[PDB]
Amino acid sequence: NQVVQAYNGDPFVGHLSTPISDSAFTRTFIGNLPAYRKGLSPILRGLEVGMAHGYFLIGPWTLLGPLRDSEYQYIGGLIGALALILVATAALSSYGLVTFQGEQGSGDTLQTADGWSQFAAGFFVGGMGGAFVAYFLLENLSVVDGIFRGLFN
Amino acid sequence: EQWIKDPLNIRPIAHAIWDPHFGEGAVNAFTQAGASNPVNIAYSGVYHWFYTIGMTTNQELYSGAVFLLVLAS
Amino acid sequence: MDGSYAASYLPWILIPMVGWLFPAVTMGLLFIHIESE
């Protein structure tokens, strides 16, 4: 009833097949994230990765920021999130320029210069879009509260 | 808590209505049996059964609910 | 929909999730599943 085998039946690779690293749920979940999902073009997986992080980065400066005790509470959070997504996409494109210069194959469409460039473009679009949509929900928070409770219905 | 004071007068509340579709008329109509939220009146008779088998406080029902969560687990 | 009871924000977040996220996610996963291979 052993639950920790070696990774993929290979006992000399440096990995164990633990219930977290190599379970069925982990295979179906980690293997279906945009970074690992099958058949996607790099632009759509970069777009889906980007929105999940733009929507995330709005919060930390919105609730904990130099502007959190003023009337421009959400604008400061949005400005910080755009700064972070800008430097994130600059880092992503610099990584693409650096890593993928020697010619490699096309076994994975993401680990190539065109693929990583598409991933960086999608990450930028998704990140700034997610940041602005979280800003738009937060700025119009009275509206969202009223429509979820039924103050206008 | 309120129903076991006078079970003849107060209607037993099942749970709370929360849907975003309710207009002002429906919210004021479904506010009943001494509540602030819109509520559903319980017709399953679980209030009478809990009152008869000796349950007389919300903490007793909460302990029963957590115990049945553990039993289902 | 005011909530007089304890944790009134909890239905505020759980009615959209059980109404949309649970159906959209469950039908999405089942649509990928019943049509796989």
Binding site: - | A65, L69, S73 | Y5, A6, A7
Partner: peptide, 30 residues
């Protein structure tokens, strides 16, 4: 009445039947 944190305590307790129900249903699927 009932407390605010008792409801969240009930939710995090009921997270355990969620995990065990998921694993039982997965094991029935075999």
């Amino acid at each position: 009445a009932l407390s605010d944190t008792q409801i969240l305590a009930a939710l995090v307790v009921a997270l355990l039947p969620a995990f065990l129900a998921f694993r039982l249903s997965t094991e029935l699927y075999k």
